[PDB]
Design a protein around this ligand. Structure first.
Ligand SMILES: *C(=O)CCCC[C@@H]1SC[C@@H]2NC(=O)N[C@@H]21
Ligand SMILES: *C(=O)CCCC[C@@H]1SC[C@@H]2NC(=O)N[C@@H]21
Ligand SMILES: *C(=O)CCCC[C@@H]1SC[C@@H]2NC(=O)N[C@@H]21
Lengths: 184, 510, 510, 256, 88
């Protein structure tokens, strides 16, 4: 409705070949799934991930508090309210909210994503070590302090983990020199 | 005529579905197994939710290279990203590792030509193994070979047409300039690799052994070399970053012309299957096409009673004003004079031109040459070549010889040109060629004449076929006739985004 | 190195002499027996007395089409007519009746591109039997196929670049637009003929029998149709009339730079045979070339101590200022940064650029990619593509891969590009290709290694050869090295005739 | 305005949180992202080259719906930081996006390997980009503003459309401790009680002349502002500077 | 209900307004006549077919009336030559 018939704004998914389903990833309760909708609000089909394929018709009125869905021929009239992030629906004797959620990353993290490395921001010398080598620390913990140009660069552990310290007080250090590694 | 059109559109849609898959299934499995999005899912994931996507030449290189290179190994087209229409060019890494074949270069250059002419931001999703070395002389060195891609990036960047790259896989040799020449480059960590010379060359030149991650991995370029501007965790994070970049470009220009509210056409567009013969030898009134594609069926014909083998008039399509020029028979001198006058009106009124080609050629004979049909044709060609408004061309039937030139064929730079599945394009029609060559060879028996004509008909049928045309990028796609209104409607919104030049004509041979 | 250059130049001059004859002697005899001038005598008869003539691609289509199409059936080049440099395009009616082969189209379009870029009047001496029908799909319909000739005529005419035709023989089908699209057209009485459909088509369509003089002879067009503007008694009268037309165009624009009196070079230009190795594997100092081609030997080198594998500096050639950019080894990042800065200086000083290519490529290895050599190369490519001054390129040695792009190869639209006879051009050098592919194939016996490498070497030697290049219009000609100074000196006077655009660059990847 | 203005979005933080995250003592390092994410609309900040030249932070945001390219010091300037800044300014110039400079700059990295690396040439490229940029420029001095770092970050000589100081800022050809240390190094060896007596007048000079009220008294800036008003002041200024049309893009020769 | 209607034409159409003259679109020859001369016809009835340029142009009557045929099969015809006329 908001597209106002402007072809580039209408969510038709038009293609020269097979049209692309309008795709929503939705979270409600303990269920997160895609809904794929093809067609137009007057006559559409919707398929749900881990679910079935249903006929859909959707009767949206701008600024209305009510919205109607005919699902496999069963018309239900919902009270609807929407925030930046949640859709609240009530109808058919039940009430719920649904969140639109981001896609999962196609590549999951390696456990290295829990690890971090501290590097000297400046050339200078290590003036204090705040943590014993190979010890558990929290992301609030100052691990190594470098002095350069009369500035104390106190470097804070970015993660909770086992901190291993690579330098001793009085060591000269270069830019980007690893001073500690902190591991999950 | 409906069943013949249905059979042709079923063949079209089968070919489109086959090309859309990309490479062999084992290549798709190896691509996804490394945690990548498939190239078409990369494109779809870049678009705004439910955006249309006007794919450029999906059947490029079809029937070429033993069909080993579906879509020429590339996905290109226009889609809405962050509220702007952008040209997206994505290397299909599943087709031969994204190797550039000669048609892959041609398709990349055509996508950049569309972006330059319409002022569209360019997004390059880069994942290519380089040039197809057995045909390197067709991939390199000429003016419209691979080196021209970067010439296009630089000069478009000079005009402020944003050039954005995301490096999603390999990027080697001259291809390393696709990221490095872009205004803003994204690279995926532990996937994207950029180098002017890769591990095999480093080994052959220096004896050093390196992996493609040590030589030019994403960490190296994002932290140390500065060749890249954003480090992405994965393909989805790269597409998200590209969307955020495009959100900084600001809006497109408003059209030069006034756009009204779109009015629905008076007919279901599959009625076009009823009115257009597939056999080009069968005449029909092209008004039956026009009144079905235009808004509300409203069509104000100019010079309706004069030069009646050419139909010219004003309509709207999706609220955009359009001047339609459509063939309705053989071109006479009166028809070309009519066309030139109409184009001058459209130029001054700033109205886009739509050419519906179904042209056998000009009228032949001594009284027509004495009447100066050649100079009336030249006046129409001058008007077409010099017209400053956007031109769109749909080839709905024949497109032969000098009639192709008068009707704004590919040489005249229409912003887009598409073929219907029944179209034919050749220096002359196949039956005309067979007839003229038989007349030159002289008297023959009917069986001797048929045996003489069959190879000529076969040549012109094979070369003039619309899949032969589209495989070579002579057009931007074969389209379903019933989609014509939508395709033009999408294009009319694109071509309004460039400002008009002033009106300027060559000397009309008066 | 002298004897190797002498052997190569002797081969060049033998090929040029063979191509200059045009068609077979029986065809030349039939041409002259009808009282015509030979096409090359038509061109020579058009020029001012003793004018030089800078022929475009005289060995086009060499080794193609079974060598049945010498010069691609066309003579094209720049000569002085009535005190102005004009682009002359003449159909060689002795070669296959002047049929347009695909290279004939490409050569015609290149001549029009030279005329557009340098604002040169175009003279078309028309005498053509039409398209080569067996390859009509390479002659028609694409953007750079035969229809583009008329688009060029129209848009050049819109810019006031005079388009002049003389119809000296047949002119058929779409070719009828060559005269009809001209601003002013001459036709020779009783042999020039113009028609959109010829006698064979008139017979096949209507059964009427007509001669080519009854249908569209010179009397008909000059008295009745008005397709032509002057009736010439013979070829020499036609050339006289064309000279009178050109005398009405007024003068060329003066150069945008200051031209000083030319100072002689300090050496005989055949000394270039002594200093340049034919074998591209042999290093030499390119200053030995530069100091020999420039006026007085004066060369003001810029950043002489930095990036020393690229030589950049200011000189004069025939009094015109030039910024010379010449390869002197492998390109480093420092070299590309140097080149980009020098190009910015030339752009602001309005000084035309001369590129002397002998480039293997960029320096390879992990520390160079980490140093961002691709980013520095991209800065040089941006400067080359965006430079507003005229660019000239001479390929004096290798021209391989991305080094071709950084050095203003054909994709970057230098106003002219020429090859020396020892040059090579390919996506990589033949030895590099053979080495990299052998390294990928792995360990093998030397007798097996040579058997694997020989086909690769043969491919890159065959495709990279400068006659293979020039046959396809990848360059504007193979030239004798000792002629380099003259060729550049002539071209510098041509390229000054167009006004400069304003300075504008794409985003430099700093 | 020549750019697109969107509906303004509130910042994610009370602006007096700026008092927590910025040290008054310029010798204490802090991450300038703590400032940026508090002043921009919705906390949204698209950083450009986040992993490279990390002592300069550059990125796109909105303030009161106006687009801004923020350029902020985050340490000493390196050559990498200056080429980053120049590239980002070229992007903002083509995108017609106004530039906001947040100065806290001691200067460029010193030493033989940096001069051999051409740090002066990279600084010159950033200075060229700043001087030639055709978009409006706004400058807030949030900390130190010393020497050639002032010039590289669009100080008063570069005609920022407005320039303001925070009351903790300092501005002089050197910092006071740099001047005192360099002059004591030229004095050579001296007793600590003699070194402090030598340094005290130099510190006094650079503290007196570098003070923000000494600056504003002489119109070297358009005002000392409360840090918590920075978002409002820039927002007001962003509505002003959109009222002039842009000149075309044009740069001097970049010393590549 | 009230309808806003278009203004009436200031001249009534003449009795010829219902008549149609069918003219050859191309030079060619008549290859069929579809209705007997002087018959009634109804709109969309093919009245004359001309072959030209190796194409068949079948010309329909646009209106009901007496169809008069002006040509015979095998006649050569010029452009714009009246082949039939339909009288209301
Ligand atoms: C039989 O094929 C004769 C040709 C019929 C098609 C025509 S004639 C007139 C048009 N001009 C041309 O060159 N071909 C077309
Ligand atoms: C032997 O041929 C090893 C290959 C040498 C190729 C050289 S290396 C450096 C340049 N870069 C390139 O691509 N070719 C050149
Ligand atoms: C201590 O008093 C000396 C401080 C000044 C030197 C440092 S070096 C790096 C910064 N750049 C500059 O000019 N001064 C700062």
């Amino acid at each position: 409705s908001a597209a106002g018939g402007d072809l580039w704004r209408v969510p038709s998914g038009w293609r020269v070949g097979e049209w692309a389903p309008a795709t929503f990833r939705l979270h409600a309760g303990d269920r997160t799934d895609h809904v794929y909708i093809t067609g137009n609000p007057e006559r559409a089909s919707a398929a749900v991930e881990h679910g079935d394929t249903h006929t859909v018709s959707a009767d949206f009125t701008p600024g209305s508090d009510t919205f109607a869905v005919t699902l496999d021929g069963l018309r239900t009239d919902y009270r609807v309210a929407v925030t930046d992030s949640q859709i609240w629906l009530s109808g058919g004797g039940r009430t719920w909210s649904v969140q639109k959620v981001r896609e999962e990353p196609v590549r999951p993290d390696d456990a290295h994503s829990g690890d971090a490395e501290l590097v000297s921001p400046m050339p200078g010398s290590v003036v204090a070590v705040g943590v014993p080598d190979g010890s558990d620390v929290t992301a609030g913990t100052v691990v190594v302090t470098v002095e350069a140009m009369k500035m104390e660069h106190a470097l804070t552990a970015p993660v909770d983990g086992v901190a291993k310290i690579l330098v001793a007080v009085g060591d000269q250090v270069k830019v980007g020199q690893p001073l500690a590694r902190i591991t999950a | 005529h409906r069943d013949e059109h249905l059979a042709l559109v079923a063949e079209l849609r089968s070919k489109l579905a086959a090309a859309a898959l990309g490479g062999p299934e084992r290549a798709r499995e190896r691509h996804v197994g490394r945690g990548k999005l498939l190239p078409r899912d990369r494109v779809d994931g870049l678009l705004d939710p439910g955006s249309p996507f006007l794919e450029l030449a999906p059947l490029a290189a079809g029937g070429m290279y033993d069909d080993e290179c579906p879509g020429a190994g590339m996905i290109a087209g226009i889609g809405r990203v962050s509220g702007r229409e952008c040209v997206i060019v994505a290397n299909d890494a599943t087709v031969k590792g994204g190797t550039y074949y000669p048609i892959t270069v041609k398709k990349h250059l055509r996508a950049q030509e569309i972006a330059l002419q319409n002022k569209l931001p360019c997004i390059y999703l880069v994942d290519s193994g380089g040039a197809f070395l057995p045909r390197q002389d067709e991939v390199f060195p000429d003016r419209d070979h691979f080196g021209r891609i970067f010439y296009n990036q630089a000069t478009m960047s000079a005009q402020g047409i944003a050039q954005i790259a995301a490096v999603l896989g390999s990027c080697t040799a001259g291809g390393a300039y696709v990221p490095a020449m872009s205004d803003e480059a994204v690279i995926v960590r532990n996937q994207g690799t950029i180098f002017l010379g890769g591990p095999p060359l480093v080994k052959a030149a220096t004896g050093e052994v390196v992996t493609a991650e040590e030589l030019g991995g994403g960490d190296l370029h994002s932290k140390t070399s500065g060749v890249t501007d954003h480090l992405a965790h994965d393909d989805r994070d790269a597409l998200r970053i590209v969307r955020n970049i495009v959100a900084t470009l600001g809006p497109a220009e408003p059209p030069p012309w006034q756009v009204l509210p779109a009015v629905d056409p008076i007919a279901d567009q599959t009625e076009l299957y009823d009115v257009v013969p597939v056999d080009a030898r069968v005449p029909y009134d092209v008004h039956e096409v026009i009144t079905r594609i235009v808004d509300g069926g409203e069509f104000g014909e100019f010079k309706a009673e004069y030069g009646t083998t050419l139909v010219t008039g004003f309509a709207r399509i999706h609220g955009h004003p359009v001047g339609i020029i459509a063939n309705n028979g053989v071109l006479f001198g009166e028809s070309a004079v009519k066309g030139a006058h109409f184009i001058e009106l459209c130029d001054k009124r700033k109205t886009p031109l739509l050419f519906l080609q179904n042209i056998s050629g000009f009228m032949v004979g001594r009284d027509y040459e004495a009447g100066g049909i050649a100079k009336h044709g030249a006046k129409m060609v001058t008007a077409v070549a010099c017209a400053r408004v956007p031109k769109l061309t749909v080839v709905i039937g024949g497109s032969y010889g000098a009639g192709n030139y008068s009707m704004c064929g590919r040489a005249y730079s229409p912003r887009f040109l598409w073929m219907w599945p029944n179209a034919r394009i050749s220096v002359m029609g196949g039956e005309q060629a067979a007839s003229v060559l038989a007349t030159v060879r002289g008297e023959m028996t009917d069986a001797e004449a048929e045996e003489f004509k069959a190879p000529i008909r076969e040549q012109y049928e094979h070369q003039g076929n619309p899949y032969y045309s589209t495989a070579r990028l002579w057009d931007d796609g074969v389209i379903d006739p019933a989609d014509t209104r939508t395709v033009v409607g999408l294009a009319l919104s694109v071509v309004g985004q460039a400002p008009l030049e002033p009106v300027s004509y060559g000397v009309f041979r008066m």
